[PDB]
Every structure is written in C-alpha cells, then in structure tokens.
Write a protein that binds this ligand. Sequence first.
Ligand SMILES: Nc1ncnc2c1ncn2[C@@H]1O[C@H](COP(=O)(O)OP(=O)(O)O)[C@@H](O)[C@H]1O
Ligand SMILES: Nc1ncnc2c1ncn2[C@@H]1O[C@H](COP(=O)(O)OP(=O)(O)O)[C@@H](O)[C@H]1O
Ligand SMILES: [Mg+2]
Ligand SMILES: [Mg+2]
Lengths: 31, 521, 481, 162
Amino acid sequence: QQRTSSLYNKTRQFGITAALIEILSAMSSLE
Amino acid sequence: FKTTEMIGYVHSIDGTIATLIPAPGNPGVAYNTIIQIQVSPTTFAAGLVFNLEKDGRIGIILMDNITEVQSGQKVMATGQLLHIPVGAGVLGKVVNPLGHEVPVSTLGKVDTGAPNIVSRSPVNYNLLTGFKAVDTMIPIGRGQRELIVGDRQTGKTSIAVSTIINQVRINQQILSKNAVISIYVSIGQRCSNVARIHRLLQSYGALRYTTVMAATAAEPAGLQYLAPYAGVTMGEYFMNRGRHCLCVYDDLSKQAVAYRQISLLLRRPPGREAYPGDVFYLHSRLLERAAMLSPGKGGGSVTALPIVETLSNDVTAYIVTNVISITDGQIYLDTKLFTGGQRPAVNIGLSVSRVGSSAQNAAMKGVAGKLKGILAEYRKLAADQTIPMIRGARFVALFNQKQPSYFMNAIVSLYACLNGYLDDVKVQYVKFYEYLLVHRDLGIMYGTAKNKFFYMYVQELNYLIRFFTLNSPILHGELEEMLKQHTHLFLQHYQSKMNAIKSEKDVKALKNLLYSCKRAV
Amino acid sequence: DHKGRVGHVSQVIGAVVDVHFADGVPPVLTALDVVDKLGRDEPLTLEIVQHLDAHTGRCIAMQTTDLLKLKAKVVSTGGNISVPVGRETLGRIFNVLGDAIDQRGPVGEKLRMPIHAVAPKLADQAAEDAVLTTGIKVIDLILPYCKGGKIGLFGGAGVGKTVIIMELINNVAKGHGGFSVFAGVGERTREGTDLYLEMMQSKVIDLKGESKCVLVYGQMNEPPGARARVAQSALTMAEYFRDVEGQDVLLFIDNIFRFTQANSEVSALLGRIPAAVGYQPTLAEDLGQLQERITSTTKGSITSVQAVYVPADDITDPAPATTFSHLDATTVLDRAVAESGIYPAVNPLECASRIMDPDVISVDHYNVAQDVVQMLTKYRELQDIIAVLGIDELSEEDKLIVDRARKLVKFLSQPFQVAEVFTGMTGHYVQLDDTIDSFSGLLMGTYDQVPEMAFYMVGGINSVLEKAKKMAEEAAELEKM
Amino acid sequence: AKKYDLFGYEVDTNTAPWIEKIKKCKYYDEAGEVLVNMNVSNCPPDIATYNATLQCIYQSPSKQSTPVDNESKFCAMMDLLEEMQHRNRLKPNEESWTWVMKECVKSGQFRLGYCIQQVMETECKGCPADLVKANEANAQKAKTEGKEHPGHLSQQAGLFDV
Ligand SMILES: Nc1ncnc2c1ncn2[C@@H]1O[C@H](COP(=O)(O)OP(=O)(O)O)[C@@H](O)[C@H]1O
Ligand SMILES: Nc1ncnc2c1ncn2[C@@H]1O[C@H](COP(=O)(O)OP(=O)(O)O)[C@@H](O)[C@H]1O
Ligand SMILES: [Mg+2]
Ligand SMILES: [Mg+2]
C-alpha cells in the first residue's frame, strides 16, 4: 500500500509536468 | 530526376531539413513534389516540399547528399510527385525510398489514393504465416492489415520474416498468378540487421519472390518517413495487375519518430508525446492502400504486416494505440511468454483477427473452430484433469516452433490433438511425437503399414487436403489409420523408454533429444 | 452574392490553406473550388473555417493538397458545401461533398441542402418515450434503447462496436418503415464494402427496385477536412427526411470519435493552443453543434446509434467523456468482459438509460432489471472475498447468490446473427417478453438445478433448456462409456 | 446469357478470345499470366477456361527455359482446382479431374493416382478406365523392380536418432 501510493503520487506529478511541457511546447511553435 | 525550372536558392539548413528563398519572379513550386538542389555543377541532391509559406519561402526535407548541401545553392524543381522504379525486375534487390539500388520497369506514384468502396471485395484467400498458433487462432487473409506488437526481442521481425520464407515452398510449386510476392521495408534499423536478413532470405530462396526496401539508421529521417510508402507502391503494381502481395513494415514506430523530427524541425505544432497533429493520418493512408481488390479490378491484394514496438507492454502509447485502431486486429507478442518458453510468444488472449473465419482454408477452418472451444475452457480451468485440460495442454506444446511449418505437417499434427491421439502421450514428448510423424513414419518402419495413398512423406497431398479437408469421406478413414499406427507404435516402442531411463547420461541424452525437437516441427 | 468571387492561394501548410480575395473574403463555412489546372487526377475544394483579415481567409482541404502552387486561382461556390437530399439519394453511396462514388450513373437529386445547418431550438424539441426492442438481452433489459433516442456505443479497440451496429441493422433497421443513413466517419474502407454487399443481399438497398438506406463515407484514407465534415453530410440527408418528409429515421455514425480526432488535426494546423490531452480547445463546442442537430423534432424523429472509440481504454479521456452527456442510452463495452468470453462485451454497471424508469417501461421490466444490477453489484463484492478467503468460506445464502449471479453473467451473453462466422453458431433474436420472464425466473431461483454452461451463449429460456437437455444427454453417454 | 459480379456490374462473358491465348502456351506459367489478364479486363475464367489451362499444365514442360526448384505439375494443378471450387464457386466437370489422373501416370506418381481415382469414382463418377490400369501398372512396377517408398522410412533404427 505504501509503495503503490507513492507510484500514484509520482504519476500524479509526472503527469502534470508532462501535460504542461507539451501544452506550452505547442505555443512555442505558434510564437 | 527531371529538372524543369529554377525555383529558388537555399537559405537555411538544420541537419536534414531546409528552407528556400524564391528566385526573382517568384515561380512557386508545387506541393509534395521533388526538387533537385545543385550541390556541384555535375551532381544534384533530392528533396521533398513540405511547407509553402506566405513569404514565398519553401520548406524542404533533404534526402540525398546531405553533407554536400549548402546555403546559397541553386534549386531546380520537377513539378511532379515522387515516382520510383517498380516491377518484377526490382525483385531480389535492395532499394531506397527514392528508387536507387543498394549494392550488396514502368514507374508508379508513391503518393496515391487507396481503393474506394466498390473497388474492394471481402477477403477470402488465406495467407499462411506457417505457425500453428497464428494460422488457427489469428488467421491472416490476403489484403488484410494484421499488426505485430510487443517489446524488443519478443520475435516481431522473425515472425514477419518467416512468414515471407513460408511462401517459398508454396510459390515454387503453385502457378505464379497466386504467388505471394513479399516486400520487406526496413525503417530506421541497424545496417548489419538488413544484411543478415538479406543472407537469410537468400539461403531459403526468398529473394526470387521478395524485394527489400531499406532506410537504415544512418540514412536521414526523410527516407525513413517515406520508406513504407515506397514499399506499398511496389506492392500495388502486383495488386493492380491481378496478383497477390505482402508488405512488412519494420517498423512504424521508427517511421513516426522520423516524421516527428521532420515536423518539429519545420515548426509544426506538436501535440501528444510531441508528435504532430497528423501522425494518425501518416499510418492511416499507408495501411488503407493495402487491400483486397474486387473481381472487376483483377482480384489482386496487398497484405500488410506493420510492426510496432511497445515499451514494457504499454499499449496506451499514442503511436501504438493509433496503429491498433487502423489495422484489422493484432498479433501480440508477450515478453513473459518469450522467456517462459513459448516461442513464438503469441498471447492468444490479447491477439485477435477481425476477419479470421472467412480468411481461413476450408480444411483449416474445420480443425480451428474446435480449438477455440478447447483453449477457452483450458484457460478458464487452469485459473480455477478433464478431456479439454489434457488436449488443451498438448496444443500449447505444439504451438512452440522456430522455423515455419508446412500446411500439411501443421494441420495433421493439430488434427491428431483435436480427435485425441496425443492423450496417452505425455506433454514433454509431444515434439518427439510430432517429429516422428512428419520426417519419419512408424507404420512403414516396423510392419503394420498397408495404407493405399495417405502418408506423411508424400508432400503433394497438401493440396488435396486443402480442397477436400480431413473430415471428408475421401481422406477420413485413411488418415485415422496413419494416426492409429503412429500412436500405438510410439506408446509401445518409443514411450516405453521414458519409464526406464532414470540414470545419469541417459536423462541428459533424453533432454538434448527433446530440446532439438522443439526447433524442427 | 459573392457567387463566383475570385481569390488566390496565399499559403499552404498541410490540409490547412489560406486564400487571398481581392474584393473581400467570403463568409465563414463557404465552399471554394480551386479552378487552377495543375497535374491533378481529382478536384480540390476548400471550406473557409477562419478569417485572418478583411481580404484573407483560412480554409481546410476536403481532398489532398498535392501539387498546389502558390497564387493558384480559387473561386467561391455561392454558400456552404451542398449535398443532395430526398428519395433519389436512397440506395446510392456518397462522399463528404455529395458526389456519387458507386459508378451507377447520375443521381436524380432535384434539391441540395447545405452541410452546416443550425440545431433546432427548445420549442422544436419533443419527447416520445417508447421502447425500441433491439432483440438483445443486455440492452433491452438493463439499458433499453428508446424511440427517438441518441444512443452511444463506448468501447476500446476491438471490443464489438462495429459488430453491435451491424446486429442492430439486422435486428431493427430491416423491419422499419423509415429510411436509414450511415455516416462512415473515418473508419475502414474495407468494412464499407461488407455493409454494401450484405445490404444488397438482404435487399434493404435494391438496384432494380425500392431502397431504404443511404451511405455517406469519409474513411481513414481521406484527409482530415473530409473526415471532419462527413458526419454533417449524412446528418443533412437525415434532416431532410425528418423535417421535410416528416418521418421516423435512423442514423448510424461509426465512429463519432473520428469526427473529434479529425478536428484535432486541423485545429493544431489552424494555430489554436491545444487543451487537455492534446485535443482542440473547441472539443465540447464541436460535438455540441453536431449532436444537437441529431434530435427528435416536432416535424420528424431521428433515432441515432453511434459508435464511440475510447482511446487507450481510458474512459476519462475528453473525447468519450464529453460525448456521454449528450446520450440517452449509454452502452459501455469493456475489454476484460470480452476476453473472459462474454459477447457482446457490455459491462452493465457503467451503462445507463434514461427510459430505465417505472413510468416509461412496465413495472415488471424495471423491478427485474434492477435486481440484475443489484445482484451483479453484490457479486463483484463477493468475488473479492473468494479470491482472499475461498469459495467454501462464504455463507449458505451467499453461495446461492454466487450460483445465480454466475448464471446471470453467462446468460447476458448472446450469439449474434451477423457474428455467425465468429461464434460458429446461428443467431438469436430474443423477445422483450422472453428477456424479462427468463431473467425474472433466474432471480426467483426457478432455474437453480439448471447447469451454468447451459446459459452461456444462447437466446431465451427455450434455448437454455434445449442446451441443458443436450448437456444431460452427452454427459449421460460419456459417464456410461 | 447475361451475367453480373458480386456488386452487380456488367461482366465480360466473351471467353473464346482468351481461350486461344491459352492454347498457344509453350510453358505452363504463361497460362497463369493469361488468367491474370482476363480478370484484369473484367472477364472471369469460364469452366472451359480452367480445363484449357489444365491441358497446358499436362502437355508442356515447367516454368520456361530454366527449371524451378520443386516444380510439381500436380501442386500447380490442384491449386487451380481450389481456386475454381471455393473462391470462384464453380464445380469442376468430368474433364477437369481426368487431366489430373493423366499427370499422375505420366510423371509416375502412382500414390497420388490411388487417391484421385477414389475421388473421381465418388465425386464426378464418369468412366473410371484407361488410366486405372496404367496407374496399377506403375504400382506393380515399384514393387517388382526394387521397393516402394524411400529408404529413410524403412530404416528400423529407432531410439536416440536425431
Ligand atoms: N520462434 C523463435 N524461437 C526461438 N528464437 C526466436 C524465435 N523468434 C525469434 N527468436 C530469436 O529472438 C531474437 C530476437 O528476434 P526478433 O525477431 O529480432 O525480435 P524483435 O523484432 O522483437 O527484436 C533473435 O535472435 C531470434 O533468433
Ligand atoms: N457479439 C460478438 N460475437 C462474436 N465476436 C465478437 C462480438 N463482438 C465483438 N466480437 C469480436 O471483436 C472483434 C472486433 O470487433 P469490432 O466491433 O470489429 O471492433 P471495434 O469494437 O473496434 O469496432 C472481432 O474479431 C470479434 O471476434
Ligand atoms: Mg525487430
Ligand atoms: Mg470498429
């Protein structure tokens, strides 16, 4: 339970980094 | 290629991409056309047009002589889409996406629309991979698009290459009208891997009925992007001229990465996993050109075997999920089954053929319809010994094989297990039982033969079985003799030794015998 | 006005193309023919999506943009993309533009309507709450499709969406006095042939005589501009039969995800910033204007079955999640249910229907249907206990619930008539009265002595007792031997 | 009479021009190339066309100037039967299987001949004669001269071989 919750929490944060890098890498292409 | 008009000068280069400034007058080149850049007075360097900006500037994807391209060089236009050399004369050779032969014929458009609704027909002609696991459970028809997915070193190339090698035994014997001509496209692979496949195709006589499209990792993204398109073009020649063809793309994962490089370098807005908007459209228009044409247009075919590498059995990746939604099902290769023993490591639960039943042969449809019922009950009962549990376990042992099996040698060994000839035979000795069925024969050995026609040494019965099936008044009684003689003699004379041999240097001799029997079907 | 107003191609980046007009830009959604010659085999038609300035307008290509030079002559049509309508369309196949793609001479048309119609107002809406008996056990019992309903088939790749649409065309669309329309939105060109042939064999489409189907296909091979707009082309034809002719009509969109996905391609190239999970920011608005047109008006009644692709089996994804709000009967297909052996692969707990109500359907229908949902909910809780503890550890009454609930899961499976090739068994149309009575008796415990595998892959109770008789006879023979 | 394909388009029933192309055959792989060219020009093979092809398989040598590996006129012949029966939906007449029986006795593959006379007797009845005695002659020819079958089967070695 400890180690799966940590993976849920890592995936939560890693998801939002990766979400926003893609979204803002879009508008660098659009100026 | 054929020059026409000097459209502009080279402005910027960024590896394998460039942009041009228009020459005085502003002629404007046509979209998606080839253009020749004068690297020297004598030599040219090809390139494809990908962007036509408002300024007058033209985005180029470099193809040849990339080191020799420079800023300020003149650029001639073709005013035409990319055409390449295609025909029977191209077979047994390695070729670029642009058409140049690699050292070791009327042209056709690479950018072509797929056959429309009335142009196609339902898939009926079978395509034998030469695997009992695949040809029964996940049967591929001619004109079908069957995906191959799985991790690195799971047997994605081998199962695709052995499918091409399986055609030679048929193609040699059959009329050339119905011969499966193969087109192995090698996108982004290592160079020595292409050489080993060339030698492997040459040793099994496959080069006669095969042509190798090649865009290695050294070669630029422009060629890798265009390599599967050039592969289909070569197949469509056979399709449109009433012949059947096969196309392997190894692999579409590395094509997408090459297309992403091109798109990102030319400032196309990226989306999911940094790929452009039209990365779905990339694979869709490729795979839809593979089809089964109608009787009205020859009845030819291009069968597609796209390979797509997954990272740690993750089907949720963008490129993998795209190709699954395009193709007519998949052949999933599990990493745990590979290391576990089962080779090819075909996960039957995950794998699926969307047009399986209609694609199979009449004989193969008879046996395989029952196998779905047996393995369904075996998988359920394995989680939670019946007759399904006995016979189901033997099928799993039979599905293991290195090189592809001949249609006669496969279907008889499966028919034996279906009617229950390997029930008294133990699970470890199924490959020794199958080896002695195909190559040797026990009825002719000992004494008790007396069959008028049906034997396993006579390979020509293959095509009689395909016509009439095993469950038929012609072959049923004669076949059930062959199997009754083989089982009784194997159990009495050959399996008796295994109760005996319980000593050092005999148990090891038994192992080395049984391990070599896994390879030869 | 603006009828043959000339313009020139300003910029070409993929399917997205800018056009400069000297005497001002046309309106939005205006179709434009590219008159300039080039080396083309097929024509090019651009639809204006945006305006950049008073003289320039950004567009999307319905055909490929190959060989298109800059400054190429472009001319307006008059208005939106126009598509033929009426009874002359019946039997024929069409593309996004409305050109016949079946090689059977010119269409009889006599009127053309624009693809981009406006959705009905609040006053035009009307509710007719009657049950559409699909002849399928899981649907008719748990999530019954209503007359006039917008229905959605949500599921991942290779679960039974295309199979269920084909079975509904067999079960419902054949014995129907209304006509039908099939929007082949971005799906397999090869699947389109099999539908055309099977309808010709069954004579719902007829060459020599009366036809009762229209086919509008914009498949995977086509560029994003076509695949986006092709859903609306079919919807315009169904709108004619609804509004003008005043009739009950069926619509079949396979797949509605491919509309959203097609718009996601152009939206990137148009220069919009993508929203969540890389979709267009106008995702909810795109579905809004499309799905709102699909409705039962006072004049007629559309009854739309739709297929919905759930990408990566992620139901929380925007493309299905946004669609769920629009639908009357939401059908959810699960992969684990398919791989376990149950076809169709309908997970009944995630499903829902608006007409699952004592007022619309009968009291006996609602009470039996709720007990199946209740029993299956208890069964999922008990399934976690058996994995931990064991089957023997359960109580006396709970064991009997498992025996019934296991039979309920098996009895929910059904061999489809279109899927004779897959299942290897003849189909079963199960009546609504048969479906309710057979499931009612199973909940009572009248079929406790009936074995479990009798219920797997059969129709109603007569086929269950028939298979149970065959199981008793074959088990008697093998025991004797 | 008039005829239509699976979609319902008109189909060229004019077979006779394509038949005379198959008669000028020389090597039997050229017959397949003609059979392609009929289908390409919306003209499906007739029941007489398949029999005209079957004739060319019997008479000529194999591919062209060079021989192919594992030629088998029987396997090329039996593939063509599978095409007409299952896919094209045409029952082969009495002429069809008589060409097959000739090739068994000509090449000397008598074991096939035993299987196909059983087929010819049961399926298409006809007249089971002339070739039956010629086939039975080749069966006795193998027995009296040396032995029937190959030597890898006879061996009697057993145990840990290969
Ligand atoms: N059926 C099989 N039995 C035994 N070995 C195999 C089989 N298929 C593939 N291999 C071996 O596994 C290795 C990887 O195979 P390959 O087809 O290249 O997989 P991938 O394409 O996933 O890298 C090769 O060295 C090959 O010899
Ligand atoms: N009712 C059913 N009966 C038998 N097989 C089914 C059924 N529904 C789905 N399948 C299986 O699912 C596979 C593909 O389903 P399909 O509907 O074509 O895909 P999708 O769900 O992506 O539209 C088929 O190969 C078939 O075996
Ligand atoms: Mg590989
Ligand atoms: Mg589908």
